Curated annotation (Swiss-Prot), chain B:
Keywords from the UniProt entry: Activator, DNA-binding, Transcription, Transcription regulation, Virulence
PROSITE patterns in UniProt: HTH_CRP_1, HTH_CRP_2
Transcription regulation among keywords: yes
Recorded coiled-coil stretches: none
Protein name, UniProt field: Listeriolysin regulatory protein
GO cellular component: cytosol
Lineage: Bacteria, Bacillati, Bacillota, Bacilli, Bacillales
GO molecular function: DNA binding; DNA-binding transcription factor activity
Origin species: Listeria monocytogenes serovar 1/2a (strain ATCC BAA-679 / EGD-e)
Described function: Positively regulates expression of listeriolysin, of 1-phosphadidylinositol phosphodiesterase (PI-PLC) and other virulence factors.
Amino acid sequence: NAQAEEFKKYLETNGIKPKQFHKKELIFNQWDPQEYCIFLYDGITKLTSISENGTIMNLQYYKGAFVIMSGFIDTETSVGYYNLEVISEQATAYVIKINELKELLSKNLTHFFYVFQTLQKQVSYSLAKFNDFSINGKLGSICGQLLILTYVYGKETPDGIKITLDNLTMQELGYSAVSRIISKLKQEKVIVYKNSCFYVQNLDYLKRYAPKLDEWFYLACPATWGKLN
Amino acid sequence: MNAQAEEFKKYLETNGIKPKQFHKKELIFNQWDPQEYCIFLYDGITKLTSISENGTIMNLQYYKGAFVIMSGFIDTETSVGYYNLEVISEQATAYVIKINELKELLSKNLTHFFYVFQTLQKQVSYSLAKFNDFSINGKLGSICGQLLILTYVYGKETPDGIKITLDNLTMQELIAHSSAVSRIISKLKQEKVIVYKNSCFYVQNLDYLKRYAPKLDEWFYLACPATWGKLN
Ligand SMILES: CC(C)C[C@H](N)C(=O)O
Ligand code: NA
Ligand code: NA
């Protein structure tokens, strides 16, 4: 994105430098009282919450470029006890103390608005996920996930749309009640695991069962969406 | 009341924006309008709705004033989704600003920029907590969480329990008339978590709602700690 690149320059102009993280690192954690604004520039992360019994809930995935804020901008207090875990081999992020961010955003409105619109993409993202699940249940949820991977990481090959992610990342994304749906799907030539890649062969099936996430992607990432429509 | 929201209302009126009044079943904005708007919902209760190919109304999200609902992206001014905003309280008051103008107004005053920004932050965290509670407890979590936020916002401690100070019409409305949801609500009533008495509804087992909607309880504690404190 051009808006993302301009934001990166703005931060670096103000002496905020990128930090590199490796897989399994927490860019921020649920036990830290200081809250941060993360500009994830490159890599893939997941937002998790861990309960007192140790169970890890995967709430949301983010890939660069995107913005994730762990505290409220006005109060600087937590928005939820969440971690941001790196699941790609490496990730690059700019890590800004929440108070420090208020100062710099105030001197510039173009860059405020890039972060503002990122929140809007998350709200409508979450609502679309809910809408698709209400209509088509878990199949809808899973189709949406496959759909976004095709749009974001898909590559046209004679064998189909190759999901161009390191194999380790594919495992991190979930690849007994879930097991059966992916089985029916390959059983129906929607996906296949060949040449150590991942291929979608009926993209229309995914659109059918994830219509509102497809619309979300059309409305929020039209340029990406257009690659496969 | 809500001090940060009252200042926003004054800031809008200082810039010449008048409030409009709406009545139940009206759409403040709709999914077919090419122009997108910023809604500052000042008073009343609303729901965000969509329509599928076959004409079924889907209830996606509820909002109550004071709050901000934006139908288009602030930068591109294009739709964030094919949504309608339907009034479900008897009446509602909202300020309706075209999206292109909101950008000017927030740029000239950063206190009020932050008020709208943090409304979005509350939406994001609310949805993640709703998702988390559904993941753990399914649809029971979603309903317990909905009743929990109603209790915190409209509840008043009484000897008969926490009275919900909302008209019974509005309160039954709040997939419409889903068989699955009706049975969950009536089970809570059967177990005396929420009861009908003397024309009002009283939550008598607040702990039960908190147990099954733990992440929305934390969300409310983090987002409105003073209101959370009143009933804890
Ligand atoms: C989405 C929620 C944060 C909004 C809330 N229901 C309100 O109107 O206050
Ligand atoms: Na933190
Ligand atoms: Na519209």
